[PDB]
């Protein structure tokens, strides 16, 4: 997980062209839905 | 042709026929055509699973080490092959792409559960 | 052979074209002029990228700052807004020589030299400054120099050695056993010799190319 | 404020100067610019030295402009810059001197502190405090409050003008704030510490009304937000200082007014320049207002407030200390004249040698 200060440094650098912030990915590969 | 400028590179040269791709791992001056003049052949890559279900990569690890020691660059597909083999560390985008795929399947599973829950509401309505 | 014959016109053309380049060299005021309404360079018609639009209207060029100072600000400290936003540690140039473009009607284009201090670490020699025509420079006030330049280095925590890749580690251990060397030491890569500078580290301006003098 | 001895021009008028006809010298420079050839610093120096009339100043003004936009702009000599201001004052062309000083980027006139006092003091004696204020703002823009004499004169002009100006525009608050702060920092007396708190207050007003970029853009000031925090620290420092220091009551009222006003108000250059994690200055005003009242109570309890107005305190400071500064400045002025005289002789000698060599070169050719 990036430091909270560094995530804000990027929100200032790319202000106006941002995406929803992503958290830690799933621990394993989710079983394919069937 | 008589090239001026450029560097040696290790890349994949596309061979085979239509719908049947096959690659030759080669060391070549970067300005040469993809399938044209090369310096040395360093292996081959067959991207199609064989009868045993195995995609076959051949790496001349002695000559590859020689040409990386002499300044040879690497193409991005070749860095991915060297990472899967274990000769290089896994490429940053190999890890990032696998994380994106995990996050994208997590959503799909959640949507299916929600649809089943919505279908459960339909079952409750009867 | 001997049927290959001289090409006087080709030799004359090469030399003649060279003379025009030397005499008709363009100037910084002309190559790096800008139209702020369209954000496009008139000399070549080059339109600046989108991510630079805000700063072109909101920030100053280096020699715009230095033209207002006595001796063109020799000895003063100058930083960049891009560095201020990216790095917490002080990053600045200590100016030593400044050659403005006298042709410019405001003396706002030229070349500069100085000593770099990037992320708190100072270089030992002066070199030419790159990206002098960028709208990114901020002159440091004299009364704020002491607080601005104050830096205490933290102990370096980046690893100095790492394991070998899984296959390349197995090949090393296999060679040891084949050669009779019996040991359980783990092969380790040493990263000190090959540590990478930041991507935004100032580059060598002396060896950089200059745009041609043919207008579009 | 300065004595007649400080503004006397007997020493400058007694300098050894070569006699060159301006017309002849004008032609030499004109030919050089036509051929795109560099002009000597000694040449422009000779022109300024031999100005003999009001009309000659107009011609010299054009050539100083041409010199600035030439290959040898950097080599304009200090004595040449000082002679220009001395000649302008001599022939009554004070407006011309102030014009070139404000348009320094075009003419290249960056005077030393002694020359600044000569021009600033002329306006003060004539009562033109609008021109004198312009000189002070130019000194601030160049960050040239080094000599103590300049600091005393600058603070007298600022406080005298502020008393007359009941209404201040945001540009005036910024210019006055910067001038007070920079001049005040040099001075450790009560007047100096009052001007530091006065300057931070005005700049804090512009920070919370128009943004921090209005304060620092094109100004010799820092870009970190929190100018009202710097003002409050001055109060906290004086209150807790072991030595007995006092802050004028007038400044404290200014800060109280600023805090109230900000607390209860009634193309693509739109960027958020502060990190999201950091608290905005607007949100911090409630805490700022508590510190002010606490500091004001402690200061009054310790009797560290000076009821006297800042204009009256500054006048006493100038009277007491300025006489001593005049003696020191005039002593340095004499040394500068001798240093300039020697350097000028060296340039004249070097010019003569190269011209003699030029004859030998033609003889060989
Ligand atoms: Mg770049």
Swiss-Prot record, chain A:
Subcellular location: Mitochondrion
Coiled coil: none
Pro residues biased stretches: 23-34
Source species, domain of life: Eukaryota
Family: Belongs to the bacterial ribosomal protein bS18 family. Mitochondrion-specific ribosomal protein mS40 subfamily.
Complex formation: Component of the mitochondrial ribosome small subunit (28S) which comprises a 12S rRNA and about 30 distinct proteins.
Protein name: Small ribosomal subunit protein mS40
Taxonomic source organism: Mus musculus
Gene that this sequence comes from: Mrps18b
Section of the entire sequence shown: 205 to 238 of 254
Curated annotation (Swiss-Prot), chain B:
GO terms, molecular function: structural constituent of ribosome
Transit peptide location on this chain: 1-25
Location relative to the cell: Mitochondrion
Pfam families per the UniProt record, alphabetical: Ribosomal_S16
Keywords assigned: Mitochondrion, Ribonucleoprotein, Ribosomal protein, Transit peptide
Record text on subunit structure and interactions: Component of the mitochondrial ribosome small subunit (28S) which comprises a 12S rRNA and about 30 distinct proteins.
Keyword Mitochondrion: yes
Main localisation: mitochondrion
PANTHER family found in the cross-reference section: 30S RIBOSOMAL PROTEIN S16, SMALL RIBOSOMAL SUBUNIT PROTEIN BS16M
GO cellular component assignments: cytosol; mitochondrial inner membrane; mitochondrial small ribosomal subunit; mitochondrion
One BP term from GO: mitochondrial translation
Organism from which the protein derives: Mus musculus (Mouse)
Matches recorded under NCBIfam families: S16
Record-linked Gene3D superfamilies: 3.30.1320.10
Family that this chain belongs to: Belongs to the bacterial ribosomal protein bS16 family.
Protein name: Small ribosomal subunit protein bS16m
UniProtKB/Swiss-Prot annotation, chain C:
InterPro entries named among the record's database cross-references: Ribosomal_mS34
GO molecular function: structural constituent of ribosome
One BP annotation, GO: mitochondrial translation
Keywords per UniProt: Mitochondrion, Ribonucleoprotein, Ribosomal protein
Tissue specificity: Widely expressed (at protein liver).
Biological role stated in the UniProt entry: Required for mitochondrial translation, plays a role in maintaining the stability of the small ribosomal subunit and the 12S rRNA that are required for mitoribosome formation.
Similarity comment: Belongs to the mitochondrion-specific ribosomal protein mS34 family.
PANTHER family: 28S RIBOSOMAL PROTEIN S34, MITOCHONDRIAL, SMALL RIBOSOMAL SUBUNIT PROTEIN MS34
Oligomer status and interactors: Component of the mitochondrial ribosome small subunit (28S) which comprises a 12S rRNA and about 30 distinct proteins.
Protein name listed in UniProt: Small ribosomal subunit protein mS34
Organism field: Mus musculus (Mouse)
Organism phylogeny: Eukaryota, Metazoa, Chordata, Craniata, Vertebrata
UniProtKB/Swiss-Prot annotation, chain D:
Name of one Pfam family that matches: MRP-S27
GO biological process: cell population proliferation; mitochondrial translation; regulation of translation
Keywords attached to this entry: Coiled coil, Cytoplasm, Mitochondrion, Repeat, Ribonucleoprotein, Ribosomal protein, RNA-binding, rRNA-binding, Transit peptide, Translation regulation, tRNA-binding
Subcellular localization: Cytoplasm; Mitochondrion
Domain of life: Eukaryota
Major localization class: cytoplasm
A Gene Ontology cellular-component term: mitochondrion
Coiled-coil features, chain-numbered ranges: 326-365
Any one GO molecular-function label of the UniProt entry: tRNA binding
PPR repeat start and end residues: 77-111, 112-147
PANTHER family in UniProt: MITOCHONDRIAL 28S RIBOSOMAL PROTEIN S27, SMALL RIBOSOMAL SUBUNIT PROTEIN MS27
Quaternary structure, from the entry: Component of the mitochondrial ribosome small subunit (28S) which comprises a 12S rRNA and about 30 distinct proteins. Interacts with NOA1. Interacts with MIEF1 upstream open reading frame protein. Interacts with METTL17.
Role of this protein: RNA-binding component of the mitochondrial small ribosomal subunit (mt-SSU) that plays a role in mitochondrial protein synthesis. Stimulates mitochondrial mRNA translation of subunit components of the mitochondrial electron transport chain. Binds to the mitochondrial 12S rRNA (12S mt-rRNA) and tRNA(Glu). Overexpressed in hepatocellular carcinoma tissues compared with adjacent non-tumoral liver tissues.
Similarity comment text for this entry: Belongs to the mitochondrion-specific ribosomal protein mS27 family.
Protein name (database record): Small ribosomal subunit protein mS27
Organism lineage: Eukaryota, Metazoa, Chordata, Craniata, Vertebrata
Gene field: Mrps27
């Amino acid at each position: 997980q990036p430091p909270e200060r560094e995530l804000s440094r990027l929100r200032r650098l790319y202000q106006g062209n941002l995406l929803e912030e992503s958290g830690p990915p799933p621990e394993s590969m989710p079983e394919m839905p069937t | 042709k008589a090239y001026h400028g450029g560097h040696l590179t290790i890349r994949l040269a596309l061979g085979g026929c239509t719908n049947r791709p096959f690659y030759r791992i080669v060391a070549a001056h970067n300005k040469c055509p993809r399938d044209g003049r090369f310096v040395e052949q360093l292996g081959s890559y067959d991207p199609l699973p064989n009868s045993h279900g195995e995609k076959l990569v051949a790496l001349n690890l002695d000559r590859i080490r020689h040409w990386i020691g002499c300044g040879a660059h690497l193409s991005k597909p070749m860095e991915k092959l060297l990472g899967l083999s274990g000769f290089f560390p896994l490429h940053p985008m190999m890890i990032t792409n696998a994380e994106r795929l995990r996050r994208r399947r997590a959503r799909e599973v959640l949507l299916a559960s929600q649809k089943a829950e919505s279908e459960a509401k339909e079952t409750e309505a009867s | 052979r001997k049927k290959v014959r001289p090409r006087l016109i080709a030799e004359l053309a090469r030399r003649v074209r060279a003379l025009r380049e030397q005499r008709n060299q363009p100037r910084d005021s002309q190559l790096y002029a800008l139209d702020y309404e369209t954000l496009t360079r008139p000399h070549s018609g080059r339109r600046l990228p989108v991510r630079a639009w805000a700063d072109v209207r909101r920030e100053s060029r280096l020699l715009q700052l230095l033209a207002r100072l006595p001796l063109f600000g020799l000895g003063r400290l100058v930083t960049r807004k891009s560095w201020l936003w990216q790095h917490d540690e002080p990053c600045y140039w200590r100016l030593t020589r400044v050659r403005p473009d006298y042709t410019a009607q405001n003396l706002d284009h030229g070349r500069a030299w100085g000593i770099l201090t990037f992320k708190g670490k100072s270089e030992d020699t002066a070199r030419e400054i790159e990206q002098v025509m960028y709208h990114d420079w901020r002159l440091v006030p004299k009364h704020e120099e002491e607080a601005f330049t104050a830096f205490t280095a933290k102990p370096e925590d980046r690893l100095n050695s790492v394991p070998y890749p899984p296959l390349l580690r197995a090949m090393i251990l296999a060679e040891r056993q084949k050669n009779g060397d019996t040991s359980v030491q783990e092969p380790l890569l040493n990263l000190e010799r090959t540590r990478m500078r930041p991507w935004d580290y100032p580059a060598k301006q002396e060896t950089k190319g200059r745009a041609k003098g043919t207008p579009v | 404020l300065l004595s007649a001895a400080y503004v006397d021009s007997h020493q400058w008028e007694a300098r050894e100067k070569e006699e060159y006809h301006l017309a002849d010298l004008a032609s030499l420079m004109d030919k050089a610019y036509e051929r795109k050839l560099p002009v000597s610093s000694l040449s422009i120096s000779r022109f300024v030295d031999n100005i003999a009339s009001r009309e000659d100043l107009d011609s010299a003004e054009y050539y100083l402009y041409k010199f600035r936009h030439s290959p040898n702009c950097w080599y304009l000599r200090d004595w040449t810059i000082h002679s220009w201001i001395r000649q302008c004052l001599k022939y009554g062309a004070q407006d011309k001197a102030l014009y070139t000083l404000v348009n320094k980027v075009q003419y290249g006139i960056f005077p030393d502190n002694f020359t600044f006092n000569l021009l600033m003091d002329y306006f003060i004696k004539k009562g033109n405090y609008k021109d004198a204020l312009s000189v002070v703002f130019e000194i601030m823009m160049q960050e040239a409050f080094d000599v103590p004499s300049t600091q005393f004169l600058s603070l007298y002009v600022l406080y005298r003008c502020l008393a007359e100006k009941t209404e201040l525009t945001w540009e005036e608050e910024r210019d006055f704030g910067a001038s007070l702060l920079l001049s005040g920092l040099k001075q450790r007396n009560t007047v100096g510490l009052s001007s530091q708190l006065y300057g931070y207050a005005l700049l804090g007003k512009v920070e919370l009304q128009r943004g921090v970029r209005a304060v620092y853009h094109g100004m010799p000031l820092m870009w970190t937000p929190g100018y009202l925090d710097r003002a409050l620290q001055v109060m906290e420092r004086v209150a807790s200082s072991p030595e007995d220091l006092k802050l004028g009551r007038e400044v404290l009222d200014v800060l109280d007014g600023v805090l109230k006003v900000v607390t209860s108000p009634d193309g693509s250059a739109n960027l958020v320049e502060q990190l999201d994690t950091e608290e905005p200055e607007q949100s911090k005003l409630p805490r700022y207002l508590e510190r002010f009242q606490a500091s004001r109570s402690k200061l009054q309890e310790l009797n560290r407030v000076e009821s006297e107005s800042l204009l009256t305190l500054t006048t006493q400071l100038v009277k007491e200390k300025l006489p001593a500064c005049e003696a020191e400045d005039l002593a340095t002025y004499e040394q500068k004249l001798r240093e300039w005289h020697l350097e000028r002789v060296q340039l004249i000698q070097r010019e003569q040698e190269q011209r003699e060599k030029a004859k030998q070169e033609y003889q060989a050719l």
